[PDB]
Amino acid sequence: RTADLERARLGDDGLDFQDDAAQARAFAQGVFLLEIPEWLDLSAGDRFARQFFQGTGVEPYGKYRDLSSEHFGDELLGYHSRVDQLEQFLLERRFWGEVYPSEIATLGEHLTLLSHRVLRSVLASAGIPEEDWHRASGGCSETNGSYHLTFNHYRSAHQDIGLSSHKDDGFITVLRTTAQGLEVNRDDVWEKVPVDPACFVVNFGLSMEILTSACVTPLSAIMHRVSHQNFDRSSFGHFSSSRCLPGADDGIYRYLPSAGLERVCGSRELIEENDHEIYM
């Protein structure tokens, strides 16, 4: 079975769904489709996702295979081979200008500002006072969050699930996928996410679920996975998290209606605990 998702577009007033009920369903499901702006070139990102794992013999992006987590002082970044079919290149915004090719950093900036606009629509729909958005979002209601532009390749020769079931860590994931494999578990049945290369997939992460757990319409971090791939597959995603630097962590908060924000845990703590549960 395949999920019937709502489609939205960024317009003059923010996220535009077909109607208010459609937006309600999309937000309650925790996953929806977002039209890719026509001016936005994704071809360099798509090529990077197809090449990053192939090593320095493959121009212009294969060389990023050689950049392991040590080159960054942050074990989460660089090239990672996972226990599932997936292998990844992960890089946080603070390194894009220095480390990514210039056109890949440009892509990451476009996606940051786009995700910024998406997140502020969601925050307004949740009824959180505007002056709490910055702390509630760890800077992502502006542009001071932590942002990962992450590229994925599924090694079909590996006899694993493509990517185990998990929820994302942060507030918003903007996912660029062009092939089948992504599945979501809204309402206790797994469903394929329909493929539409003219749309991003948008879903919420654990920090959105924590943030809104006490609101009148709590939003959920959708459980999703990538089924076992018989041929190779690639994708990439822009992930927005509470500012989670090694030295400067913005914290994870739950909004208490009529009271304010209360601290739950750290942003890096959440990413580490989540990343443990997925792969072990």
Q: DSSP class of residue 230?
A: S
| Shortest Å, Cβ 32 to Fe ion | 15
Member of 6, 168, 183, 249 binding ligand 7QX (CB under 6 A): 168
210-249 residues in contact with ligand 7QX (CB under 6 A) are 239, 241
Nearest position to ligand AKG, beta carbon: 235
DSSP 3-state assignment of 174? strand
Token pair for residue 101? 């090719």
The token duo for 252 is 């994870």
Site for ligand 7QX in 50-79 (CB under 6 A): 76
Residues 262/256, Cβ–Cβ less than 8 Å: yes
Residues 6+ apart with CB under 8 A from 90: 76, 77, 78, 80, 148, 150
Measure the CA–CA gap between 52 and 265, rounded to whole angstroms: 33
Select the residue interacting with ligand AKG from 105, 118, 122, 226 (CB under 6 A).
Answer: 226
Determine, following the binding rule CB under 5 A, whether residue 250 of this chain makes contact with Fe ion: no
User: What is d(CA 225, CA 273) in angstroms, rounded to the nearest whole number?
Assistant: 18
Q: Which residues contact 38 (CB under 8 A, 6 or more apart)?
A: none
CB 120 → ligand AKG: shortest distance, Å? 22
Compute and round to an integer the Cα radius of gyration of the chain: 18
Write down the least CB distance from residue 152 to ligand AKG, Å: 5
**Residue span 86-125 as binding mask against ligand 7QX, x where in contact by CB under 6 A, dash where not:** --x-x-----------------------------------
Q: Choose which of 29, 150, 234, 235 interacts with ligand 7QX (CB under 6 A).
A: 150
**Torsion angles phi and psi, residue 177, rounded to 5:** -130, 140
Instruction: Output 16 or 160, the one with its CB closest to Fe ion.
Output: 160
Instruction: Output 121 or 203, the one with its CB closest to ligand 7QX.
Output: 203
Binding site for ligand AKG (CB under 6 A): 150, 152, 163, 168, 175, 177, 182, 224, 226, 235, 237
